[model samples]
Target: ANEVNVYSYRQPYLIEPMLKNFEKDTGIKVNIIFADKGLVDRVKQEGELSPADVLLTVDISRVMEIVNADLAQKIDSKVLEKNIPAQFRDSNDQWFGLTTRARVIYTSKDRVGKLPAGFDYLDLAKPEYKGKVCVRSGKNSYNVSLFAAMIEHYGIEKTKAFLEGLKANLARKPQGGDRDQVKAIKEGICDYSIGNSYYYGKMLDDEKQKSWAEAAIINFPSGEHGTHKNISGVVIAKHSPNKANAVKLIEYLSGEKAQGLYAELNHEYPVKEGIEPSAIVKGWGTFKSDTIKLEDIAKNYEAALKLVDEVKFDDF
Candidate 1:
């Protein structure tokens, strides 16, 4: 059947259009099994009998899960190498990032007023911001990875201190998704919060959330050197039934056409160079991004979670 099967954690609406375009351009059929979770364990249980040709997941942790489970095959393709930047791809060629998103600060324009000069992420933990910050669960992959990056930049001891300070600064108990943090700001529960850059775009598209979106501004906070970034990535299954088609599909997603579709539809930054973000995304202004390898961040995943527990971030 000249077809490739995909086990994707990314929602269907965000990716289906690209898949349909791939089918039209390549004449290869795509079969997808979409789920929010358990796709990793399901593929592991199926082992060699699994028909999944590709695995697409959001966040570095999920992609690393597939790699950690030994369910992904290393792919060597010049197309991928030429299109995707080195920082966004696996060092071993086992995975490649398809889109990038920054963890940005959303501060209330009404309550916080103007942002201070030379603002950065670390500033959120200062005593001045205490009782004014909001965030999702520290265990959320977005925050965990951000902490991992922090630990990479600042040593464990300092990072632990930062976590403690941040916990103390929380406006309320950690709860809800990224957008909810923005909503919290709108309701006067918080003056500042953390969220992915794309949510601001999503918020602007919905009428109910437009006010919340309008009430906040996106701040691209940086570490000593640059902003922290994470990705939605792809891998070829270890037991892909259609290896050739799988490779083609992955290359297509990393190419210009699909990359543009990803940026336009999902408001994510394309992994490929030379592809500009959507107009709304571009208006957020650019900043230097931390150059730490994602593999390094993934290595600290366990310790990041441990720090979260030790600080009891979510409990408060």
Candidate 2:
């Protein structure tokens, strides 16, 4: 076939720009099937007859969903290795993180006068903040990925205990998206919350939610252990009929030009070393990031979900 078929969880528009560039550069037609939940399952059913050449998804949970399902094939590319950092790519080369976003703490500007030095995630659990933290369901894909990393760093026992403490401190039952937590801060429902970094930018630009976003200040949760990382990445379908073209397309997406577009479009930090994130993103200041290989975190996925249910984290 002269084309590469893409199954993406992201909306068509978010990825369309980059694909257009690839098409212009190499005349290889790109056909995308955009659906939020069933792309992976679709590929699995297609099996050896799958026309899907690539799969694009966000979060390590979905990335590993395909890998664990045996629907993704390994990729070995000099360009990919050069463009992406080892910490963001699969050690086995099953997938590569295209962009990264941090999971940072959000605190009230008025009530929390000055940011106390040495902020750590462990602080959220102490009695001082009892019933004062807001967050989404612990079993959410993003939180599961974060919890999985905690397991990698602290082991299941310590991480489980930490989750118990964190759960006890919730201002309300873990609910809502990342932006909802910020809205909670503005509403005085909670003094502190945690969410992905980009939502801060998104809120700042929204007219209706401006005050809610402004009510809180961004705090990079890096005191000693750096902030947790979440990424959006790409993988080739295991049975891709256009493997060679798929490789070229993926490699092209990893290049500097595409990375710049990704950063500009999503407010996410580029995984490509030299590419700069948006100026709005830069205005938030910087912090050292936790570089724990996502591979190790993905390794703990099952354990992380099990711990979430065992702790009954969402029950409160």
Candidate 3:
């Protein structure tokens, strides 16, 4: 059978259409095992007998975990190198980002008036914004990655101080998903929050969340440098049973057609350059993105977690 198997943490609905398109464009079939957890251990136990050809996941932390587990194969493809920017892919070419999402600020459209001059991410910890910010738990992957980026840019001592200050400013103990922060803004629980850019688009798409989405505005936080970005990426399994087919599927996903579909479906920014995001995403306006390599951001993961614990960021 001309087929490739995938172990994916991403929900099937998000990528099934792209996979179906690949199947139709080429005669190769895609066999997918969708799971919410334990994919790494499953592949490790399966070892040489594993049928998985590709592993797809969201966030640099999870993708790096697969690489750290020695479960990913190094791929050297011209298509991938050309399609994915250098910052978004593994330095050794073991994994490639499919989409990028910015961690941005969400502010109340009504309650919050004009923001301060030179307002940025670091300003979230300011005394003036005290008791006006909402966020998810610091331990969440999304927040951990955001903190890791801050550590990369600001160093440990300063980052720690920033975390402490941020903790003091919480509207309530950090709780709920990104969309819930916007809901908080709508209900006047908080005037500001931090979240991924795509969630704003997703909220607008949901009938129940449309009002919450409407009550908030997206603000891209720029530092002395640029805004922070995170990714959802893919890897070829070390023991891929169908390497050729897997490469073709990966290439297709990075190509113009599939990239557009993936971005539109998820409201994420495409990894490939020149690919436009959905109309809703573009409406969020543009800002300069941080150039720090994601791998460098991953290196600070432990420190980020430790700092979060030390500051009791989620305990309020």
| TM-score of each predicted structure versus truth | 0.96, 0.95, 0.96
Global lDDT scores for all candidate models: 0.90, 0.88, 0.89
Error of 2 at 58 (Å): 0.2
lDDT digits (tens) for residues 1-316 of candidate 3: 4899988998889999999999998989998899558689999999999999999999998998899999999998999999988889989889999999999889999887435435678898989989999989989989998889889989989999999888899999888899998899999999999999999988988899999989998888766756789999899999999999999999889989699889889999998999998888888887788888898888899899999998888886
Q: Which segments of candidate 1 are over 4 A away from where they belong? A: none
- N/CA/C clash count, model 2: 0
lDDT (Cα, tens digit) per residue for candidate 2, span 1-316: 3899889998888789998988988999999988579878888888899898989988888898888899888888999999999999998999989999899889999988435767878788788899889989999988888889889888999889989999999999998899999999999999999899888888888998788889999888866667899889999998899999999988988888699887667778989988888888988888888989998888888899999999999996
lDDT at position 3, candidate 1: 96
Q: Tens digit of lDDT per residue, candidate 1, span 1-316?
A: 4899988998888899999999999899998898569789989998889999999999999999899999989999999999998989998999999999999899998777646556778889889898999999999999999999888878789889999999999999999999999999999999999999999999999999989989998888754746789999999999999999999999999999899888678888988989998888989887777788888899888899999999999986
Better of 1 and 2 by lDDT: 1
Off by over 4 Å in 3: 113-117
Error of 2 at 237 (Å): 0.5
For lDDT, the strongest prediction is: 1
**CA RMSD per model (angstroms):** 1.4, 1.6, 1.5
